[PDB]
């Protein structure tokens, strides 16, 4: 938990598959595990992790039905965690978990 | 617009009719129109208007399907405006409009 850092993914405004406008944010739980890769492979591993979290969130939710936002939160969180983890690995970072927090309907 | 005061209705956590948890807030647009009633009929006409806005919001949304939150926002706003206006009248206040702002799904 000590080296497990909390990242607040800035809010993402997109539309679901079934044409529903959603404002979504999330917390990323990530650990620095290869210092040499974190410091060599990218300029800034925090904001590198932030950027790809925002791009991924936008896409995963764009690719989602509203009913999945209601019923299948856990499944969506696993998709976010899978993808962001794959992304952060070249930078020596493990993503422990991803949790969608708020979901606003404007 | 000068005497039309903006009131931020504090967030209301409830469930829709079709069993959906919702966090909802709104702006109330209200005008003081009978000063004698505003000052006689109640201790504090702002917080009187706030309280009844929160109670009403909770009920109108409890009495709503999620699909009405998506599709029929305007209709829900008219219900809120009708009811809160009726409520504020004994206190010499006209409610110009009510607009649900944010709708969070926890
Ligand atoms: Na990773
Ligand atoms: Na009124």
Numbering used by the authors:
A (entry chain A), B (entry chain A): 64 to 169
Could you pull the original sentences from the published paper?
On the other hand, the estimated molecular mass of PhStom (63–234) was 44 kDa, indicating that it forms a dimer based on the molecular mass of its monomer, 20 kDa. The structure of PhStom (63–234) contains one molecule in an asymmetric unit. Neighboring symmetry-related molecules with the largest interface area are shown in descending order as sym1 (N-terminal head to N-terminal head interaction), sym2 (C-terminal tail to C-terminal tail interaction), and sym3 (side to side interaction), with areas of 494, 418, and 335 Å2, respectively. Conserved residues such as Leu133, Lys164, and Val166 are located in the interface of sym2. This C-terminal tail to C-terminal tail interaction causes the formation of the banana-shaped dimer as reported in mouse stomatin.
Stomatin is a member of stomatin, prohibitin, flotillin, and HflK/C (SPFH) domain proteins, which are found in the lipid rafts of various cellular membranes. Mouse stomatin forms a banana-shaped dimer, and Ph stomatin forms a trimer as a building block.
